[PDB]
Paper text:
However, we observe direct binding of the MSP1D1 with SARS-CoV-2 Orf3a, which is unusual and may inadvertently stabilize a single conformational state of the protein. To circumvent this and potentially capture a different conformational state, we substituted MSP1D1 with another scaffold protein, Saposin A. We determined the cryo-EM structure of SARS-CoV-2 Orf3a in a LE/Lyso lipid Saposin A-containing nanodisc to 2.8 Å resolution. We observe a direct interaction of Saposin A with SARS-CoV-2 Orf3a, which occurs in a similar region to where MSP1D1 is binding, but with a slightly different interface of SARS-CoV-2 Orf3a. Although we were unable to identify another conformational state from this dataset, the discrete interfaces of interaction between the two scaffold proteins and SARS-CoV-2 Orf3a, with little change to the SARS-CoV-2 Orf3a structure, increases our confidence that our cryo-EM structures represent a native conformational state of the protein. Instead, we observe a 135° rotation of R122 into Lipid Site 1, where its side chain is directly interacting with Saposin A, creating space for a lipid to occupy Lipid Site 2. The rotation of R122 side chain and the electron density exclusively in Lipid Site 2 supports the argument that Lipid Sites 1 and 2 are not simultaneously occupied.
The severe acute respiratory syndrome associated coronavirus 2 (SARS-CoV-2) and SARS-CoV-1 accessory protein Orf3a colocalizes with markers of the plasma membrane, endocytic pathway, and Golgi apparatus. Here, we show that neither SARS-CoV-2 nor SARS-CoV-1 Orf3a form functional ion conducting pores and that the conductances measured are common contaminants in overexpression and with high levels of protein in reconstitution studies. Cryo-EM structures of both SARS-CoV-2 and SARS-CoV-1 Orf3a display a narrow constriction and the presence of a positively charged aqueous vestibule, which would not favor cation permeation.
Numbering used by the authors:
A (entry chain A), B (entry chain B): 40 to 173, 181 to 237
C (entry chain F), D (entry chain C): 1 to 80
Amino acid sequence: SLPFGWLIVGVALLAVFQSASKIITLKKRWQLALSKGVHFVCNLLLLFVTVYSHLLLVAAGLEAPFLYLYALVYFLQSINFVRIIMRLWLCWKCRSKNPLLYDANYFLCWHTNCYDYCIPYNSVTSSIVITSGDEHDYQIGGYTEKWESGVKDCVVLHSYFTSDYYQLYSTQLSTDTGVEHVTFFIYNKIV
Amino acid sequence: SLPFGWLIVGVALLAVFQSASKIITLKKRWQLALSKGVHFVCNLLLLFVTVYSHLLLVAAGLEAPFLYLYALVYFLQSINFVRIIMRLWLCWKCRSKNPLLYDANYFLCWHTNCYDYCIPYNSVTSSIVITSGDEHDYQIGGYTEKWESGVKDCVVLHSYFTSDYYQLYSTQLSTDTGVEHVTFFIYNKIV
Amino acid sequence: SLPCDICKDVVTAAGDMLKDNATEEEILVYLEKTCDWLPKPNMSASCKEIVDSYLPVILDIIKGEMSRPGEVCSALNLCE
Amino acid sequence: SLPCDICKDVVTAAGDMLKDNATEEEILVYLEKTCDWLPKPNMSASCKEIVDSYLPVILDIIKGEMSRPGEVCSALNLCE
């Protein structure tokens, strides 16, 4: 008593959302939000399709040769869900939704009275350079955040588990480098 | 004369590869290669499943209400294929496979007799900082590349279309900043 | 610039094919059928109000979007 | 550290359940059935040589991998 057309329509929707997801650029903030929403809808469609196909195999008594496979599909998805559970919590650690929008391994956060800056970062390095300038803005590795408040002497790189604190040593104004309207802040990792 | 179990097994394989793909980290080089391979296998499974479901709908004469939808699935996928076609070509522009491994918007390349450095980068900024040091290595925005040769006075940020050339203005050794065993190279965009 | 050629050709072709008046009637029929098969009992009023009122709005904003092939192609990373 | 608890428990449980000798026999039967239903006519020799020779190799490398729950959990970003 389960309509098979549901499996085909779910497969079609999943294919549509997978095809659309891989063609969305990640330049602007709305593009990142749209990509994340499409990925979420695709994940929901994947769960629906897997559950329905498990409910059709069990309805026809054909689940025995594939049951283990479906368990894997659940187990990995469980990890996926758990992964999402960290990301949301990571957001609360920096009070920014950037961890949801970006898939970066680490996020360099620093908090002020005005704003909570959270810029993506790839790996724990011994030094971090923040470039401020050109309305001005901060950026690291091409990742740009809007300038709202000043700069702090102690920034922190967050993963889910690790939290590495960097202290500002030197500041490079547009007099010691020649790059006009640009300031460089250099942070060193604290042991 | 088409075995429907193929649709179910393809759906199961596609679900397995989608579930596995989203749980692979992107820290090490082998992890990135494995993620790209899993994404490729997932794309192949998606094409196979969509084509087979189109061949089952047409076999039962039920393709009319869904035909347009499938066209979309093809069209977006066509764009996807075209996108891949750029990435490979982008690789040839920098003679590195990093554009395949990384999904970054731009890639900062510079070529020497020994090696062709290609480091991911998010956006075209007015200045770029390259940090060299700690066996030493180069890194930008946490993206690390192994140190093989020296540094050049003219690096270039490649997209598929754009190519922005940056010239080195200032060098910050470990005497003007205090960050030991670390050197900073500052490049400004050329108008 | 080769991908731009095909991208602009495709988007202009889409704008030209959507320029037909019968396209609007087909879209309205499809929208009615969309809530005709839905299990929601209030979907008929939802379509008959929102779709009947706002379909020409989406039709005209697609007109405005198709007048700039370069912009829509740039949004897909197929152009500048 | 809560995800690490469940991750280490799961991987140790997998190592314990795979520790059974009957698990190897079941894996060998599954491997034989894998090429038993395949359309390739040379798959029988392929299994009878490669799988029969190298199944204990994968079994023992899984042994070595399960002795370090922290490492395998770290590989999945479930731990340090």
